[model samples]
Target: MRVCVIGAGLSGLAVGHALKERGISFVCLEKAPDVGGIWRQPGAGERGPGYRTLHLATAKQLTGYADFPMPDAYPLYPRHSQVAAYLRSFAEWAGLLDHVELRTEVVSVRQDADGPWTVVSRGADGAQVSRRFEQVVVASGHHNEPALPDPLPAGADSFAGTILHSLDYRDGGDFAGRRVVVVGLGASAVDIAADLSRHAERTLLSVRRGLHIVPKQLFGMSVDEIAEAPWWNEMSFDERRRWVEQALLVARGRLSDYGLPEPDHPVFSSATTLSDEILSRIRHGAVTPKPAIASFDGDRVVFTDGTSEPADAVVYCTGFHMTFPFLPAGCPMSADGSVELYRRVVPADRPGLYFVGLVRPVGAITRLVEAQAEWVARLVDGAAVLPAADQMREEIGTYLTGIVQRYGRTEGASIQVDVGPYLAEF
Candidate 1:
């Protein structure tokens, strides 16, 4: 099959390699000059408003291509540049570098009545083009569009210091000696705040509600080991579930012992791994937690409790919105800003179109994408098949229902499937 995959990040690269191995004709399109979606370190003014530090809570050895193991020298927790470089090397090893078209911006994909697809995109040289493909994979990630808060409180405009989003954060130098207020309790929020505490005059992290923080590794074993260990995966479904629960309890027990509050939700819920260093800092009062912002008056920020504090700068580590500028709005995004796809890889009803790498805070994203790409390739190559259209729709509904049930009624559950079950099922 002739295929076109969007975005040149790890997901796209993995899929491209699978397609190539299957002897399929394909092209990978990347908007950036090179690969590494969000892992691409943004330049000054290129970074968005909020957090800066990009620490990986996931174990590096467990978080690369399914077929290709990460190098032994890869850090326990890989840096952004390390991930980018790894992906670039993977692409080269797979001989996909020649097949990938860099600096190409994909606009839209439309299907023909008989199942072929027409892809429209613009190139860096200002040339517009269209191509017909047997299939298309939307590997474009969820972090491209900055997730900005609405209705900026009345006095925020007059803030004296800088205001930026997590996307705008590059590093910690500018925050040295400054009172930094980090808004949001997502992984990035905690990460940036903890990093800033080392040099900032003080670091205040604003969290509307608490979240369960899972370690990147379990008992010094990467999540990959825990998930794939013979004893774990070989058990029956119920037994497997019990084993996972026990494992999570052990993990959470240790985290709670660290003075961090016991996370009230499911042990493996939406949590990132916390470094010992970060945990130590939070315990030492260097990282102060505050309620969500109620209002802002220049440098004076008021929290939900009516308590207020003056910050030299306010950084919003608020997450991202699902966006595909090349694709028209109102396409197929879930409520939480991720492209909704059957099996979290292929679009539910859009024939010949697939999506990869848009994931929730579940298990490892890279691993999921690698598995997803393999499934997609098998389906495309006629080695596997989805249910008929009507049956497929019903299955999709069932899948979505389970997602809602597990994650609760929050923004983005549809887009963000629980990583553990999602990966296990895959």
Candidate 2:
């Protein structure tokens, strides 16, 4: 085979179908026993970023791949288990199962000077293998390593309660009848807090920074559905922000009203957390929102607002490091921790290497991955051409500059792409 696709998740499956249709010989490797990436982990009791309460924030129509839409019977937002099953069905239907190697983990991917890239991988049985491929598509997905806040609250080690990251959190029942404090204001944080609120004796959401919280729908349409609509596509950035701000105000009052800090930045400036239950849970007094943690004393969590509470456990849904451990560092991630990719797919310095599904769009990632896979397949089959190295770097610089204006130079900001604009870029 000439191409080695490193992952069999949603993005990898998309790439697989694209390459297969173009008659390109390739092998797809998946670390998990099955595909579906994080979606497959939650219900199966596997450890990953996914949680038992996880569901597609975007509508099923947009989340499913273009070649095979999600089942008609599925609800608008399918559960994690349903999504896993859908991806498995899609893989079998697309004839990708035969080409996909499950339980095989890629340990190394290095490019050669004037020859095919060499890849070393380990299989489930502890066997290692090395092979060469003309090209490599890293659909491996981010959310690799769990990233807790650096210098966790002052007396973290002194805390007597069990503390874990969101990766280890499966269900709220695990901490039932106990006080649980969930940290961060990201999607996982909000979802986990709401999930725990129902089961835990008490749930306190320790938000260090305020982030915009978006409901699954606005004006009776999934935010993603609206993203691709004609009226939304023609609006300017400021106009879109204003429109959403107004919609949010009409739908739900300000975040501050829920006892959560108001977002310091405008919506769309930074990635917004999508959840319909978090605010509702807060309103019901099931979950209490608190300011940042100041320190962790024995069986107690000190808040920045001069208040403290006793907690049995703390789940830090701080986020993850967008890491590619198999590849050489600095080439894919810059010294500042932003992804260095041209067109958010190709790393200019690394030829014959592409990263699919690396982008974070406002909506489902299905269309974006499809577009990337098609473009990459065209390149692999000699039907498309990339710009010169210098030109590619120029594009990267410009994209990062724009990102800085909207999101500042924070980690994981480089990959944020507006759904429609990104699709049109492809």
Candidate 3:
């Protein structure tokens, strides 16, 4: 059976590697010249989606390939380049390079009458191409389009200082000896503000809404260890929630002492995959917390609470929106803009079409993707069968509703799932 994978990052690589091991025929396409997706350098004159200095939120042990362990020397936390290099090396080592077609972007995918898919793509040189495949896996991750506030407040462009979105932020050096304000409190917000604190005259991190700040690790033990423990595995849902809450309490104590308040959400999850040392640096007056912004004036930023602070730059470390311009209308997408799939893996109606790494931040995204890839390979090779479409849809709806209830509405920016159960079932 022929298969096509629509990305070349960790998720796409994982699927390709598994299919290769199974001796399945497949092709991988990457929009960029290289393998790394969001982790790679942005185009010239552009900064990548903000928090460019941050690392993944999960520890190294729980990341990387499912079959191959990461290097012992790999840092507990990994930077963007480090993670990219690791994936590139894994692709090379696994003999996946031959199947990888870089500098090729999948423009659209449509199902043929025979139930196969017609994968249309455009090359870097603008040449259009199409190929047929029995199955297609959309491994393109989130963080696709940068999410900017609508109708940018008047006078925003009049600011004398620099203003840019997180995706446009190149480095912190430019902010040296300047006061800066970072809007939003998600992963990107915390990371960039903290990085800015290192050199900027002063850094102000603003939060329009409350957020949870979960630690990357715990008590000298990797979170994977605690998660994988048999006791945790056996705990009831309520028990698990309470347990995680306790852990968050401890983590919040550590973070609160650093100036940030305790997490308002029960689950203190942070998008950054950073080490305690870096977080400590942010806590030591390096990154100052502030309320959300109300408006911007020349050299001054006014807060919603009628407070103002001198500002040399303003960075919107907000979030990103979900985009699947390539997919047809009937494709299942969540109300929050995420592609809705069973376990965030397989599509509800399209049997030959699968989705990997389209999951929300429930636990470790890397681990979740790893599990999803394995299932996808199984389905491709006829080694596994899934639930009926109606059943799958019902299940997906129920689960997603529960998730929305727990995480609340993100207005279609971010997706959140219960990572533990998702992985266990996978």
Candidate 4:
């Protein structure tokens, strides 16, 4: 049973490691010149979601592969380059380097009406090739396409300043001595804002809605470590929310105290921004927070609150959309903007197709992806069986309903899951 694994990032590595353990025949393809996914982009001077100042929000212990631990010399939260190097080492250590084909991009994946799947790919030398496989695992992540605002603020075209998405941003030093406005309040927004404050003459954060800002640690322990604790995992959802709320209140006062709006939703409802420096930067006057942009006026940004400021550039860290352009229409998404998947890994109606690391868990993602890869390997090797098509579709509906109830109707919230329960589901 030959399998085609698309991608060589953390998730792809996990899949490779699991398939190797099971002695399965598989080949891993990576579009980049090497492994490590987004973590390697910044150091390679390539363009992607990663930046020079990026560091693991989750601790190294929880983020590393279950079988291959990170180096003891590395810090709790390793930098982007350190994580990239570690991932490369893991691939070599797992004997997966031989099975991986780098500098190859998958152009399309389509299953024939009867059985085998055909994967069309383009090589670095501009040559195209197609191959057949019994199964496919899409470890290509959802962070590839950058999602920006539909309609820019009025008069944005006339503004005499540079406008770019967070994907193009490499380092804060590039913006030294210039005023920059960062849009959005997600993890990237907070991290980039804090970094820019050190180099930019003025760094302003423009927020539309408030989001819970969590520190890297609480009660002197890393947040990811806390999430992995037995006590925390066993607690009920309400119990966990209440516990974390109190801790957040103590770690830093209400976000409003620092000029940021208070979050309307409760903790754990939406993706929270984890940062140890953003709040402090706000307090120290290193960064200023402003309301959403209303309009742009000749190198100046007018805020919704009727205030305005001069800005040399606008950086939109609005996040990314889940995209799989290489797949046939309706394979991953439906007409209603919902992902059609069972257990967040298998396509409900598509047999022999699977995805790993597609889930957006609150804690470290590596462990969960490892578990997912193992399950996929078992399914491919006939050690496991999936439910009927109808049952799988029902499960997808139930999962989407629960997600909407907790996270509201948002694109980013569609894939959100509780790490413990999600891991156990496999």
Highest TM-score against the true fold, candidate: 4
Rank by lDDT, highest first. 4, 2, 3, 1
Task: Kindly give the stretch of ten consecutive residues in candidate 2 with the minimal lDDT sum.
Answer: 328-337
lDDT of 3 at 366: 80
RMSD of each: 3.8, 1.6, 3.4, 1.5
Tens-digit lDDT string for candidate 1 (1-426): 388888887788888878888888888888787876666654223453323456466776667766678889877787665676777787777888888888898987778888898888899988898888898888877776777689665678777777888776767787788888888767677778778988898888877656666555667776656766777667876776566567767654555454444456654455444544556677798987676777777678888778898888888877787666665536576555434556655666677777777666445677677778878888787898887777766656677777666666666666665556666765
Q: What's model 2's overall lDDT?
A: 0.87
How displaced is residue 306 in candidate 1, in Å? 3.3
- TM-score for all models, in order of appearance: 0.85, 0.96, 0.86, 0.96
lDDT of 1 at 201: 84
Error of 1 at 420 (Å): 7.0
lDDT of 3 by residue, 45-152 (tens): 335673456676666776666667777787877777787777777877888888888889898888888898888899988999888899998888767788888866
Comparison by lDDT, 1 against 2, better one: 2
Tell me, by lDDT, which candidate is best.
4
Residue 104 displacement in candidate 3 (angstroms): 1.0
- State the TM-score for model 2: 0.96
Q: Taking the tens digit of each residue's C-alpha lDDT, what string does model 2 give over 1-426?
A: 789999988889999999999999999999998988988898789989999988888888777777687779999988899989988998888888989889999999877888689999999889899998999898887887999888888988889898899999999988879999998888889889989988999999887677888888888999888987989878987898898889899999787888877777778666588888888898899999898889898899999889989998999998898777798654477767777888988887777888899888777788888999999999998999999999999999899888888777677788888776678867
Q: What is the lDDT of candidate 3?
A: 0.74
Q: Which tens-of-lDDT digit does each residue in 222-326 have in candidate 4?
A: 988887789987899899989988888887978889999888889876658889899899889999999999999898999999999989999999989888888
